[PDB]
Symmetry: C5
Subunit: 263 residues, 5 copies
Amino acid sequence: MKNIESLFDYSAGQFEFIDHLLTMGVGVHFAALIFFLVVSQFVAPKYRIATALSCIVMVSAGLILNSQAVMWTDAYAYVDGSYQLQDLTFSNGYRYVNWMATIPCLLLQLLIVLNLKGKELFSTATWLILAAWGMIITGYVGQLYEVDDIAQLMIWGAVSTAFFVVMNWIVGTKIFKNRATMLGGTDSTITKVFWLMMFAWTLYPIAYLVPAFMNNADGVVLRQLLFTIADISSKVIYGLMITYIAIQQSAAAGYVPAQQALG
Amino acid sequence: MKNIESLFDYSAGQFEFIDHLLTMGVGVHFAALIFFLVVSQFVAPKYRIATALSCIVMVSAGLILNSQAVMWTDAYAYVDGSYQLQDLTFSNGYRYVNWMATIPCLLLQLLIVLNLKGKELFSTATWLILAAWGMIITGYVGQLYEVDDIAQLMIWGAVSTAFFVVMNWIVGTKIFKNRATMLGGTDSTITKVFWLMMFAWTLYPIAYLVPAFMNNADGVVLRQLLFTIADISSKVIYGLMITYIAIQQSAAAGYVPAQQALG
Amino acid sequence: MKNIESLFDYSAGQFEFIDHLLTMGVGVHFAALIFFLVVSQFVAPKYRIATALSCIVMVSAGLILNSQAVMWTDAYAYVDGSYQLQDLTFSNGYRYVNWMATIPCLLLQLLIVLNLKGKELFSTATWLILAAWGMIITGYVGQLYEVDDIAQLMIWGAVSTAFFVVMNWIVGTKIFKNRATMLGGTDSTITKVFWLMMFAWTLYPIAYLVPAFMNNADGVVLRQLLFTIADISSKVIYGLMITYIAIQQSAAAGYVPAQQALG
Amino acid sequence: MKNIESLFDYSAGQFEFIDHLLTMGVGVHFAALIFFLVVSQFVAPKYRIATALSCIVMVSAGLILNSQAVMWTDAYAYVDGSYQLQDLTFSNGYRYVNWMATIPCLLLQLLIVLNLKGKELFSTATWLILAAWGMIITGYVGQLYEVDDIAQLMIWGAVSTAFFVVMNWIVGTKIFKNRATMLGGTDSTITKVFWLMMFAWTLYPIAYLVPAFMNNADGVVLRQLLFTIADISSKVIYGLMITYIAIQQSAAAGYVPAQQALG
Amino acid sequence: MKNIESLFDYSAGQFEFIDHLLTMGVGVHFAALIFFLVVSQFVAPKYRIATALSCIVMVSAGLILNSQAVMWTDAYAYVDGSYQLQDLTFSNGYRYVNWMATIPCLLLQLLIVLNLKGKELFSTATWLILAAWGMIITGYVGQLYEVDDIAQLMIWGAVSTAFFVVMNWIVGTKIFKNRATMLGGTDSTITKVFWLMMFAWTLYPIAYLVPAFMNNADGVVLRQLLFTIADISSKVIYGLMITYIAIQQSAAAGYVPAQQALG
Ligand SMILES: CCCCCCCCCCCCCCCCCC(=O)OC[C@H](COP(=O)([O-])OCC[N+](C)(C)C)OC(=O)CCCCCCCCCCCCCCCCC
Ligand SMILES: CCCCCCCCCCCCCCCCCC(=O)OC[C@H](COP(=O)([O-])OCC[N+](C)(C)C)OC(=O)CCCCCCCCCCCCCCCCC
Ligand SMILES: CCCCCCCCCCCCCCCCCC(=O)OC[C@H](COP(=O)([O-])OCC[N+](C)(C)C)OC(=O)CCCCCCCCCCCCCCCCC
Ligand SMILES: CCCCCCCCCCCCCCCCCC(=O)OC[C@H](COP(=O)([O-])OCC[N+](C)(C)C)OC(=O)CCCCCCCCCCCCCCCCC
Ligand SMILES: CCCCCCCCCCCC(=O)OC[C@H](COP(=O)(O)OCC[N+](C)(C)C)OC(=O)CCCCCCCCCCC
Ligand SMILES: CCCCCCCCCCCC(=O)OC[C@H](COP(=O)(O)OCC[N+](C)(C)C)OC(=O)CCCCCCCCCCC
Ligand SMILES: CCCCCCCCCCCC(=O)OC[C@H](COP(=O)(O)OCC[N+](C)(C)C)OC(=O)CCCCCCCCCCC
Ligand SMILES: CCCCCCCCCCCC(=O)OC[C@H](COP(=O)(O)OCC[N+](C)(C)C)OC(=O)CCCCCCCCCCC
Ligand SMILES: CCCCCCCCCCCC(=O)OC[C@H](COP(=O)(O)OCC[N+](C)(C)C)OC(=O)CCCCCCCCCCC
Ligand SMILES: *C/C=C(C)/C=C/C=C(C)/C=C/C1=C(C)CCCC1(C)C
Ligand SMILES: *C/C=C(C)/C=C/C=C(C)/C=C/C1=C(C)CCCC1(C)C
Ligand SMILES: *C/C=C(C)/C=C/C=C(C)/C=C/C1=C(C)CCCC1(C)C
Ligand SMILES: *C/C=C(C)/C=C/C=C(C)/C=C/C1=C(C)CCCC1(C)C
Ligand SMILES: *C/C=C(C)/C=C/C=C(C)/C=C/C1=C(C)CCCC1(C)C
Ligand SMILES: CCCCCCCCCCCCCCCCCC
Ligand SMILES: CCCCCCCCCCCCCCCC
Ligand SMILES: CCCCCCCCCCCCCCCC
Ligand SMILES: CCCCCCCCCCCCCCCC
Ligand SMILES: CCCCCCCCCCCCCCCC
Ligand SMILES: CCCCCCCCCCCCCCCC
Ligand SMILES: [Cl-]
Ligand SMILES: [Cl-]
Ligand SMILES: [Cl-]
Ligand SMILES: [Cl-]
Ligand SMILES: [Cl-]
Ligand SMILES: [Cl-]
Ligand SMILES: [Cl-]
Ligand SMILES: [Cl-]
Ligand SMILES: [Cl-]
Ligand SMILES: [Cl-]
């Protein structure tokens, strides 16, 4: 065994709570997809890539959640008044591997609305993507020791967090350096985004440490709840904020659909 | 066990009836989605978000119903002339957790067609959303006692209903204060909407009390029927009324597609 | 047991035929959906709702058929050279409950192309919908006696048929009263539609009586065949006729896309 | 048993090959669907129905293949180094019944680009559809004797082939009579289409005779391969040719999107 | 047995890793689909077919991955602390047969943006397609010997690689001959594409040889990882590069949406 989810038994209540969270996640992401498609038409072409990137992230994350959700119900059966493992195992590594695609998308959509262009765009994009792959690959290896070797967990943890800090650094640099060039009064909004990011992105490394400070079924419940809030904050709500920033700037630049959409 | 659905056995007739209601719910929500997409083009951009919000709700609700309906058939087997539970359990908590996303959407689409703007929009939105999360979270906890502790059910019930009343109060304030500014003769229509809301939204707390006044398989049938009607009324039919209000006001404001759509 | 489907065993040929019919139904409805979407652009806005209503009916009916089809293969297994029931039951009540949504849609799309407007539209709509819910609810109750009490079947049958007759009466009134105002030479076409309706809608009450005049597996084969033809006629082919009528009248009213679509 | 697929056992290689063919078929048809949607916009409205008809056929055929593919894996299990039948049966009749809808669509899209209009269109359409229903229904009955009575197979074979010949005759008449009126140099292209048709459509009656000249698991492999090629040829590649002919004639008629699409 | 996947048992970690890779692949392909649809509108009509070809490839490859991923979890069960085969077998042949459709699409989208036209287009298309079918069919036969006869593997390998070399030769000819006529400074970009192709396309023949140099569960892990990277590189990232080249050349040709999309 590799994940502590597979070590425990669950009460009907615990088991059903986790099923409730995973099922809700799936539908929020597919629903947000339809919304991004319908309002994409009010964004000026120069910023429409930012909205297209949200559609990518919604579909990708939605499909992973849908897998986790099926796996949860398939791995366990109710037998003698508790849910117990049965012939399949449950892991979180699905998420980790999926971040290899979605974290780039989240970061690129911020650079686009910050109005970076050309060399500066492509350069920052490259550094952010490699830092992120760095963070994710070392995280994935780490979480392979959550049952066996908590020492190893924390070691790879620390390396992973190195890359995190670099990435957060670059992002904040660019934000605070470019906030002033922002149109339509979105300098205020972009700052709220950066906060949202800091909160939501932090929940993930907390979830990564639950094995270390809560190795039991209540820990398991907590980790699944943290992942759920972090996904809805870091992907859906952040996507709504990026899109709203893009429509505001579109209108300021005199794109009429945007201007109409706002009155 | 946490829900009374899991306590009973069911006649083929009862069991099949409930599967018929759940199956129909799924398809009404996905069907209404196609309609909202096709007629969105007759709504002026200033109101198109209201229609997009219906698309979110139809997809989210549709996918939950689809889960409930699969779980129902999976949790039970026909064995000695009745349907009996088998190795999985059935709960309604799927709905509860999903309301955390859909009730905001329903409330925001009413504000948009009431023509609130700016500070007043954002302020009312915030208070309505927190009231709603309040109502939902305390309801979810409550319904965890429906088998064990009916006292606790009613206590958390009462708190939940507090938040309800605040929310209904704010909504009615805004409606009756802004009915006069409504274009295209939609002051009449908006009043019908507010009624629809009052009826449909009330079915939910009735369904929540069935354990208290009908703890048996006929109760279970009733609760599933109440949920079905309340979902079709509170989401699909209310969505059709909001969209019709939006087309009426679009045309009054001189949006041509809207004017054509009406003749 | 409520339905005679669940009383019999089936030869591989009978069993496979029924699976062939159900599977085909599913794909005809989803296919027709894409067609209605593509040609909706040639309908003038005044009539586009008629085409949108066909999309609703295609998705809703398609998803019911898809359920029936999975249930069929899940309820039975091949055991000693025949298909026999196993641990789940099969019913038709899925269809009945779904008519509560689709029959309104079918009736509304006829009124729209008949060019009814305002009070007359909303009034006729209301009477037709209540008649239809009347017919469907009493039919659903009826078919709960198909195994036990054929007397009761015929009694509720007769009530259901009352509502039918009212509904057919109103429809024909409106058709024959408004045929003359029809544009683009669609007075001829609308009459064909009314015939199609009469044939296709009648198959349903015949299928409802098979228990009474053929209580065996060949009856069961017949009922499934009748439902298949009646669904393709009453929904898909009638949809194609309504849309063709709408494009003809669009062109007559001088909508260019319609005129182009016809040359 | 009705089909010889259900009579044999299969090597892993045979069994896997057939699963490979069925799975690929499904995706080619759903992929071609997206292509027909995206390029439909370069076809003039007078010919856009021809492209819409391809979308119908892609969805319908894709969903049947998807069923066959699931049935294949469900009907057999690997047991003592071979795949053997288990509690479900496998048939081809799914395809037969589906031709009742798709063969009309294929034939109507050819008449549209041949530029037939009005009476001549509706008349030819009617004769071709009834011939085709004739061919398909007699084929279906035929193939019910593939295990029992090869005499009966060939008798119904012969009748089926009667209707074939009529249908091929009418089609060739129309093609060779109308080739000269065709725009944009598509007289060459339309002749290629007619050849493609002759080849692809012939594979079907060959597949129908395999029981007679190869009653074994290698026959079964051959029949599935013949069906796969014939489906890709008769639906996807023919669809791409009809669409290309329609864009060429659109441009010749001075539809600008078509002219742009070609340069 | 035909594939070495079916010969081994797997640790939870090995087994889970492979399920993580397969699951991610599915969602990247369906996600990239939505992106290609949204940005297709910024490509001039003359090049829009190149983008439509990416949509085909994303759906086709997505659906294959989705099958492989279900088969993997269905073929194995966790039993005595390892994953072991159970009653179904696992193969890679699904991919091979799917290349018969996707490799043509990949090659055709490169010719379109290289600006080949008419005779030269249709001629090169034909040679490249037959070369590719040659490479694929001989590969498929080869991989039927991976368990039994590694000699035969390498023989058919060698023939397959013949066709590879021809195909790479033609592609490079055309690229380096037409790089100079490329608009918008895409001569640089097209060269990067050709490199991408060389790397990504080569992984496949390496994966084909793993049986020869790593016949064990770690080899199996390697092959699945190689296929995952090769699919993301050869289809998704290459598609993003083709579409970017198409937007650049569209803008240079004075298509306004393209010019807007770039500023
Ligand atoms: C399903 C949800 C439940 C799961 C739990 C989720 C955790 C909660 C996350 C914290 C919420 C943080 C809210 C940040 C909003 C910032 C305010 C603001 O300035 O907005 C930005 C800007 C405005 O900021 P500003 O700086 O311009 O201020 C402007 C104020 N006026 C105009 C009055 C002068 O506007 C936006 O629209 C941003 C997007 C709106 C935020 C979306 C709603 C958030 C919560 C709603 C419910 C969530 C579920 C619905 C999802 C369904 C979609 C498919
Ligand atoms: C996608 C699914 C299709 C619908 C599924 C249900 C079938 C239809 C149900 C009833 C009709 C639909 C509601 C009307 C739509 C909105 C009308 C509109 O555009 O404007 C409002 C119109 C306009 O009103 P007004 O104020 O402008 O005045 C009337 C209009 N003039 C002046 C032109 C005559 O108002 C109404 O018609 C009020 C609608 C109230 C409907 C109440 C129904 C609630 C209870 C139903 C429970 C059933 C649920 C379970 C079973 C259902 C089957 C699935
Ligand atoms: C949707 C996904 C694609 C799936 C198929 C992928 C494989 C590609 C092979 C065929 C595709 C190309 C055919 C359509 C060409 C577009 C039409 C066009 O523009 O004009 C036609 C052209 C036009 O001819 P013309 O008469 O206008 O003159 C030539 C045109 N100029 C002058 C401009 C050069 O005609 C042809 O090229 C005929 C092509 C048809 C022959 C098809 C052979 C295949 C037969 C079946 C065997 C293969 C099936 C099994 C393999 C499995 C595949 C997955
Ligand atoms: C990534 C998903 C899962 C993890 C698996 C890892 C992927 C496989 C590893 C190999 C990656 C190879 C990268 C080569 C691409 C770089 C070449 C390039 O772009 O050249 C510059 C070229 C242009 O080069 P140029 O020649 O014009 O010069 C530079 C241009 N100016 C001057 C304007 C700055 O850019 C493009 O072509 C633009 C779009 C292509 C770039 C997109 C690739 C993203 C790579 C990371 C993937 C992240 C998410 C992927 C999934 C998305 C989901 C839909
Ligand atoms: C913890 C609880 C906090 C959460 C509550 C936050 C407030 C709610 C949001 C405000 C309402 C709003 O966004 O409406 C939509 C606003 C319109 O408003 P406006 O044009 O600014 O109005 C001022 C009007 N003038 C200028 C005439 C004065 O944007 C738009 O049309 C753009 C559409 C895309 C933006 C995405 C919106 C996301 C909504 C989906 C959430 C489920
Ligand atoms: C027991 C329950 C009874 C309730 C029955 C109500 C009947 C429905 C009313 C007609 C609606 C219609 O189809 O079209 C409604 C309108 C046509 O309005 P009009 O009055 O002709 O406008 C002309 C006004 N004059 C007469 C003064 C000149 O078109 C539209 O573009 C409106 C957009 C559609 C909004 C969503 C409603 C469609 C729901 C359909 C799914 C069931
Ligand atoms: C098989 C799936 C059917 C899909 C086609 C029908 C949908 C109609 C949608 C309208 C689109 C449109 O614009 O239609 C228009 C087109 C073109 O006809 P037209 O313009 O009148 O001809 C020219 C008229 N002049 C001469 C006055 C200019 O009509 C069609 O294509 C209809 C195809 C024929 C129908 C076949 C009926 C035979 C059935 C026999 C049963 C045994
Ligand atoms: C895998 C194939 C699927 C996709 C192809 C389907 C095309 C149909 C839609 C037309 C859209 C359009 O406009 O196509 C545009 C382009 C061609 O026209 P052009 O270069 O713009 O101008 C023409 C140049 N002149 C104006 C100067 C004369 O056509 C193609 O690409 C042609 C198809 C590719 C070659 C066929 C493959 C070889 C077959 C042999 C295999 C045994
Ligand atoms: C990663 C998933 C999706 C990435 C997007 C793919 C592009 C395809 C569509 C282009 C549409 C368009 O028009 O693109 C336009 C913009 C660029 O032009 P601009 O911003 O207007 O600047 C205007 C100034 N110029 C004219 C000088 C450029 O391109 C992008 O932003 C592409 C994203 C670049 C980041 C790539 C990172 C490389 C990763 C390497 C790590 C190993
Ligand atoms: C939608 C997904 C998002 C935004 C995911 C973000 C994930 C992280 C920021 C992960 C952080 C981690 C560390 C910094 C150390 C521990 C391991 C990780 C990878 C979970
Ligand atoms: C589509 C979903 C809708 C509109 C749901 C509405 C939900 C409620 C009005 C729930 C209300 C409750 C109470 C007021 C008390 C008991 C607990 C609740 C949560 C059922
Ligand atoms: C697509 C569905 C349609 C058009 C359904 C039509 C159904 C009927 C007209 C049903 C009629 C019935 C009677 C008149 C008597 C017996 C009971 C019914 C409900 C089957
Ligand atoms: C995509 C489906 C197509 C083009 C279907 C074609 C089917 C046939 C031409 C079937 C023909 C038959 C005969 C000529 C004789 C034997 C029976 C049939 C039905 C196989
Ligand atoms: C999306 C899929 C792509 C680009 C597939 C490419 C496949 C190949 C280049 C396969 C090549 C092979 C050889 C050159 C030798 C061994 C056998 C093959 C078929 C794997
Ligand atoms: C033990 C017998 C081995 C398997 C039997 C079938 C033989 C497979 C070889 C056929 C050639 C490959 C075809 C690949 C392209 C697919 C056609 C659409
Ligand atoms: C008996 C054990 C049950 C443990 C679960 C109870 C959790 C109650 C919190 C309700 C949170 C609902 C909102 C979900 C957040 C997205
Ligand atoms: C496969 C990913 C492994 C990690 C690759 C290391 C690069 C990440 C750090 C990049 C930081 C450079 C920023 C310099 C410009 C501010
Ligand atoms: C014997 C079990 C109870 C059967 C219930 C019979 C009443 C029939 C209800 C009417 C048909 C469906 C109403 C659907 C409302 C959306
Ligand atoms: C062993 C007896 C089975 C009974 C099946 C024979 C039916 C004859 C074929 C009917 C043709 C199918 C087309 C129907 C699609 C609407
Ligand atoms: C395409 C993205 C690849 C994701 C990279 C994840 C890191 C993989 C390292 C560990 C592999 C696990 C082997 C089995 C463990 C016993
Ligand atoms: Cl722009
Ligand atoms: Cl993710
Ligand atoms: Cl507006
Ligand atoms: Cl909900
Ligand atoms: Cl109009
Ligand atoms: Cl129905
Ligand atoms: Cl036209
Ligand atoms: Cl077919
Ligand atoms: Cl162009
Ligand atoms: Cl592939």
